[PDB]
Amino acid sequence: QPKLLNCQLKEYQLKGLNWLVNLYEQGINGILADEMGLGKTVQSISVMAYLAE
């Protein structure tokens, strides 16, 4: 995970970042459709922080 976050991703989010990164580096787009309140707003920040770090 990007150390830039000053935060910890949960298990179900860290694998979710890997999905986000894999689609990005393979040049394709996707839907993060997780159930409400699971933290989709957080996984969103984590992929930007990866593109930064």
Ligand X SMILES: Nc1ncnc2c1ncn2[C@@H]1O[C@H](COP(=O)(O)OP(=O)(O)O)[C@@H](O)[C@H]1O
Interface mask toward ligand ALF for 1-40; x: CB under 6 A = -----------------------------------xx--x
* Cβ neighbours for 17, distance < 8 A, ≥ 6 positions apart: 1, 9, 43, 46, 47, 50
Structure tokens at 7: 């935060």
Among 23, 42, 45, 49, binds ligand X (CB under 6 A): 42
Interface mask toward Mg ion for 24-53; x: CB under 5 A = -----------------x------------
Residue closer to Mg ion, measured from CB, 13 or 26? 13
Q: Quick check: 24 and 16 in contact, CB under 8 A?
A: no
